[PDB]
Amino acid sequence: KCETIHVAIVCAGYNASRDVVTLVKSVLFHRRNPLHFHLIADSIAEQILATLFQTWMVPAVRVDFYNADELKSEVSWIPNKHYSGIYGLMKLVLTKTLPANLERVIVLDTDITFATDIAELWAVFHKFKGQQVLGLVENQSDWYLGPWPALGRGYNTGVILLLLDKLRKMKWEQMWRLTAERELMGMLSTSLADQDIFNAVIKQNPFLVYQLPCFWNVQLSDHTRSEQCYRDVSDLKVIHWNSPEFFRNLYLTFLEYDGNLLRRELFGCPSEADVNSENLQKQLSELDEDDLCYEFRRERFTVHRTHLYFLHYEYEPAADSTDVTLVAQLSMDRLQMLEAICKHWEGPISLALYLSDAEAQQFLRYAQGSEVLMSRHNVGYHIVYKEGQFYPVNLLRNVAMKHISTPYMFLSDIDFLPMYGLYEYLRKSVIQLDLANTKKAMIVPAFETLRYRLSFPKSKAELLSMLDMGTLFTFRYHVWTKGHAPTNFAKWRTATTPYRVEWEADFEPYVVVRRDCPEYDRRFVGFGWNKVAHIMELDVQEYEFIVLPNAYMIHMPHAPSFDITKFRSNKQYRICLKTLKEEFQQDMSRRYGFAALKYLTA
Amino acid sequence: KCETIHVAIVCAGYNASRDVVTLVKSVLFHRRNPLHFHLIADSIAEQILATLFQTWMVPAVRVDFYNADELKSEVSWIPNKHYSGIYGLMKLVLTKTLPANLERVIVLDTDITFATDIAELWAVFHKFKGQQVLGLVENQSDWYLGPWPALGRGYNTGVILLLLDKLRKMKWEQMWRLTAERELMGMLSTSLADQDIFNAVIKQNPFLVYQLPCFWNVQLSDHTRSEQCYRDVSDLKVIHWNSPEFFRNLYLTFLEYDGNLLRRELFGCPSEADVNSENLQKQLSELDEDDLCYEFRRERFTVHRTHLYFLHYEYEPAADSTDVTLVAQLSMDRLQMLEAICKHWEGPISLALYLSDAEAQQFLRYAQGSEVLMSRHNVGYHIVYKEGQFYPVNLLRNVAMKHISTPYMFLSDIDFLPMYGLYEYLRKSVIQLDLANTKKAMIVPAFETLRYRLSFPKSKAELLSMLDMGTLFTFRYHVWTKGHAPTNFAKWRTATTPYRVEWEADFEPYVVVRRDCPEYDRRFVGFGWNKVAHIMELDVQEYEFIVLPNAYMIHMPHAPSFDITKFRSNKQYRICLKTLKEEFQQDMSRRYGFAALKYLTA
Ligand SMILES: O=C(O)[C@H]1O[C@H](OP(=O)(O)OP(=O)(O)OC[C@H]2O[C@@H](n3ccc(=O)[nH]c3=O)[C@H](O)[C@@H]2O)[C@H](O)[C@@H](O)[C@@H]1O
Ligand SMILES: O=C(O)[C@H]1O[C@H](OP(=O)(O)OP(=O)(O)OC[C@H]2O[C@@H](n3ccc(=O)[nH]c3=O)[C@H](O)[C@@H]2O)[C@H](O)[C@@H](O)[C@@H]1O
Ligand SMILES: [Mn+2]
Numbered sequence A, B: 001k002c003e004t005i006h007v008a009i010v011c012a013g014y015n016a017s018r019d020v021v022t023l024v025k026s027v028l029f030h031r032r033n034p035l036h037f038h039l040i041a042d043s044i045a046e047q048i049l050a051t052l053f054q055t056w057m058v059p060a061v062r063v064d065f066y067n068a069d070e071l072k073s074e075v076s077w078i079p080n081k082h083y084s085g086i087y088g089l090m091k092l093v094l095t096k097t098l099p100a101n102l103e104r105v106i107v108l109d110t111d112i113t114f115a116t117d118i119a120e121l122w123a124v125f126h127k128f129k130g131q132q133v134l135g136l137v138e139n140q141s142d143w144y145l146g147p148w149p150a151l152g153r154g155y156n157t158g159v160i161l162l163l164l165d166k167l168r169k170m171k172w173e174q175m176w177r178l179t180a181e182r183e184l185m186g187m188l189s190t191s192l193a194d195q196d197i198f199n200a201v202i203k204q205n206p207f208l209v210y211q212l213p214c215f216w217n218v219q220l221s222d223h224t225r226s227e228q229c230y231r232d233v234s235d236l237k238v239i240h241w242n243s244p245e246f247f248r249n250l251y252l253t254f255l256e257y258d259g260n261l262l263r264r265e266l267f268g269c270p271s272e273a274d275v276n277s278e279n280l281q282k283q284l285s286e287l288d289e290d291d292l293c294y295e296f297r298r299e300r301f302t303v304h305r306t307h308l309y310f311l312h313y314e315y316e317p318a319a320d321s322t323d324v325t326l327v328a329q330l331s332m333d334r335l336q337m338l339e340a341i342c343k344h345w346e347g348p349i350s351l352a353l354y355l356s357d358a359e360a361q362q363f364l365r366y367a368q369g370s371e372v373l374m375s376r377h378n379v380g381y382h383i384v385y386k387e388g389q390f391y392p393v394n395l396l397r398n399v400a401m402k403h404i405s406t407p408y409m410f411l412s413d414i415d416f417l418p419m420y421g422l423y424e425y426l427r428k429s430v431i432q433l434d435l436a437n438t439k440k441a442m443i444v445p446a447f448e449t450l451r452y453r454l455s456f457p458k459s460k461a462e463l464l465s466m467l468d469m470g471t472l473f474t475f476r477y478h479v480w481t482k483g484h485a486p487t488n489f490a491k492w493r494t495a496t497t498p499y500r501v502e503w504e505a506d507f508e509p510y511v512v513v514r515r516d517c518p519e520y521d522r523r524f525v526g527f528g529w530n531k532v533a534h535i536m537e538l539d540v541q542e543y544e545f546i547v548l549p550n551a552y553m554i555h556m557p558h559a560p561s562f563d564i565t566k567f568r569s570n571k572q573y574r575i576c577l578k579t580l581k582e583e584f585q586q587d588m589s590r591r592y593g594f595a596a597l598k599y600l601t602a
């Protein structure tokens, strides 16, 4: 009843990571038995998938990872032309990689979707007889009908059933190696990668292959002409999207399905105790539900499913080791800023987007449909899926900061447009002020405007002229000047060299710091006191606040978010935010003692 | 295998409508057999549920409605104090209301959630023996332990299994009527409404009751103390939320589940042909997928699940029959306007919100947590659930217009704040201009501002002064003046009486019209040409555009929506919008002929 079903998936890259996320969602939507995933992945995919499954907390799912690079030398001698690359040749060597104590496994591809319970496919293992060990579905295309030799139409490696014990007893490694060498002696190339090799083995030993029903692998490829195979669309099971209305709706069902709905244990089967799940349960049990601020404390320890590098990412290390990454976080309603930011900052960017699955797909379509975003590869998109009622601003900031590729980071905001050439200016400033060997934070002055149509200045003199004419203002000039009052804009107007300032109450500048800067406090959600706590923690750790003369950023106006609108620092939210501020002050007093006394009167 | 399962639900009110939506979602998430819902509902709930199920298009679900008011006289003689009111006493008379050809039924309450397949509960009907006909779960509270007499702890009417044929053969009506009369001779009142009466029958004839397992009705009431009943939380089936962490997560699973995922047919069972579903399938099949504008044409005919009156609504007819309803539509990112609008317009408001299920719950929490929104009952919230990629602005406008309660409607916008007292001014203007007997549209001048902090003028003179100082501008003054150019603001500055204007190219004012105004064209989605087509249709039907002297509205600035940002009338969206404009012009030429020739050069 609770028999563990083992699924082996080969993943490599960010696109493959998204595809395997979709496949795992499809499998979990129909599962009824414990699942053990064996992910053969390179480091790029391994980090993403490990973080995703750690934060996902799916009950009765055990995930293990295997170094795909170590297997490259196993297939480095086989030329390949399939778009999956060398990683497509690794499904042959799974018997060498998977643990020796495993008997049966279901090998899948990243472009597979499940419309039925995977236990039904696992039950097919009971029907194997004789020496049949590879459960394969006959190819639905005329590719092998005349390519690599195959039996009949050939078999498709999109879904495979393997009996590892029998393959190991029969020395599958030597068999497939000899078959591949013999085929490559004349073919000299592979058209469909290891799949072709599979067919070659099927030619030599047809008795090893068990022909599964066609509806276990519905290949929607070009010129498929398989209408008879899926004539009964109601009873279709597994779909393969190998293409370079019901199917579209089914795909969109899982592509936009909420993954947090999968955090429910399997009935009748014990769930293994995970450290993160146990910690979350203990912390939530410690919280008092009678307290009026229960929601905020619950959101503080809430673990959000995080998908690092949601889009393709590339980066090259800086030769001078002084590179700076723009760090910001945003929700969906701020997407219009992104392109503008990409037009101002030419350096690496690390963003944390708080999107739902539907919003994640909308953002993916927007990014793939935008020339500006597709022309830039050094922008890191880390999607933190929505959960709870409040906006985890500090959690998003921590996610963005932790996954940068540069020694220094600028803790900017998505609503702020920087000046042109600020990237090179900060790269020079870190060398000039020697931030590597000192605890110094370089403050970038913040300005705000109320006009959407703005002629962005190309120099500091033009910015001063615009300030004189009343078009621009210092940030929060009309509401709360205490935030940037210690910036000393009056001295900044005529300053030609960076100058040090001192911390004051409610100070919250925008700082360029090192990679190892202390993290934000996750206890603050929504709007208010988010950056004040971080600036206080910076000051208590002996950080020197330095204002640069020739740097500035302008806060473009934005409609109030639902966070502000609902919890506009009034009534229950104001009381809870004051309580959180008091708790943070108490923790500051306890942790550092004498060095943190001056913040009590702040 | 495909046996039809009949579920009887009593619904009354908007809160009950939301609850029954949640219950239906919970039932459909676990169903495996055809479902036939019998909804005993009053007109208020009947309209909402009929529209919701018509737009929902759930396969293998047959919904029928029964007049609950006609049954009131059947229980008008029984005093009741339960918060469900007289509608709570109707479950007794279901045998009188349901069709005589039905044998077995499952009676549910609006506060029920299903965590297991309802076919499992329907299979319990096979286990009935003897004269046991009411499948009930013993009450889990000490309410009946000492109230109305009961057997043991009593039985809970949250979930009932009825054999209608046997009840009719045994004359259940007379039995329960006599039992209720005898009990009320001494009790004189009902504490738990018909439930108490049920228990009384259980006292007289205990052999009629079949005691279901406890986990078929898990009552989470106050002082429940039933930990033993749900000690195995993994294998819990039906939850009753009769209260005035796993349970919370389970409730939020269905409260925020996407209902459009339920539009999948049951495997192995034929689906009945519905007129709306057939029309949608035919229209989508007619559309060419090779056309680059496939998405827009698909969205044109897409049927969106509509939930009329998502919150409690009250209204009183105007004595003079000249009342005007502010009609507007908005998405989530415009919620901050609502309260402001409620501070300006004291009359009835009809709004159409394009929210997802999670966004619907967020809006419900915001509205229940806001004093301004809870103090106003004449605001109609019609939620149109998200589907597709584009914003159905015209569909939302049609939904808002069609469900107003007043003879006249103002086709305003959510981004526009009206002047104080505009409600009474328009109520006087409709009488002054005699819009009842003439085809006249009263134009309200539109202005825009770029400053979020605005001192709203209390008179026209102050508005003129603000215009002179450059603080305010006419709407789209800096971008596209053609939209409100025919408004003739120069004449409006000194005008003291309403004056007629003439239609011009791309004219798009904001008009007060009658209830029977022609609807918007649903072929336009996103942003662009949405109101131009409606104004052209108004002009081609001989509507006189009248500008009022002492009326104005100010367009508060807003961050660009994702619709503008992505499809900012550029590239593919611009081409598709131009194509839609051309098609609308062709339809205008064909439908009216000579009277529509002047729009070709527009
Ligand atoms: O730096 C500051 O001075 C202030 O910045 C924000 O306050 P504010 O800008 O008024 O409010 P938002 O516009 O909601 O916050 C801006 C930042 O939050 C993000 N954001 C986006 C969308 C959303 O709904 N909520 C939200 O907080 C934006 O992407 C951006 O990074 C913080 O919430 C304050 O705690 C802080 O004092
Ligand atoms: O009112 C008008 O005359 C014009 O409104 C919009 O032009 P614009 O104001 O630039 O764009 P929006 O800000 O999208 O229009 C305001 C309306 O759009 C609604 N809205 C809200 C949110 C959203 O995502 N999309 C959207 O269209 C708002 O609720 C409000 O009713 C349309 O693009 C024009 O076709 C229409 O004629
Ligand atoms: Mn901001």
Ligand SMILES: [Mn+2]
Pocket (backbone or CB within 6 Å): B415, B555, B558
């Ligand atoms: Mn607008």
